[PDB]
Symmetry: C3
Subunit: 61 residues, 3 copies
């Protein structure tokens, strides 16, 4: 209704690339800084900044 | 079990208005700034701010 | 595909303590401050601070 939404959201997500979904989950579900996210993943901060930017465009298509 | 909660939750949430649900996910699941969210929803910040404010009330009572 | 994670994940946030689940949820889903979360839960901030720290650790294990 209601559930109709989260549903479709839940699926975007899942339509994200493995990387963007990881990046977004790290920074939003756990809510790590980009710094902490980048330590977890072992990449430049810029990398996460990017994966999340694109996750966000993806999700607001 | 936790299993109970998450469903416990996601029903509450599903539940919300629509416009709260949108604001909340836009800011917590997307982690968009109020300003950015407001841009996305074509309404002033104050609005986004209070919608999430209400989203927190329905979730916590 | 991309659901394989959301379940792997959401299956994890089910394992967490509950006291960890709560903390993490309030601060990340509700996007509450630690002070607010601590308030809500009836504990000092230090405890929430750590609960979400352990909470984060567990889901990254």
């Amino acid at each position: 209704m209601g559930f109709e939404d989260l549903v479709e959201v839940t699926t975007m997500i899942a339509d994200l690339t493995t990387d963007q979904r990881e990046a977004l989950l790290l920074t939003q579900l756990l809510g790590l800084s980009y710094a902490d996210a980048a330590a977890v993943c072992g990449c430049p901060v810029g990398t996460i900044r990017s994966r999340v930017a694109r996750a966000r465009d993806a999700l607001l298509a």
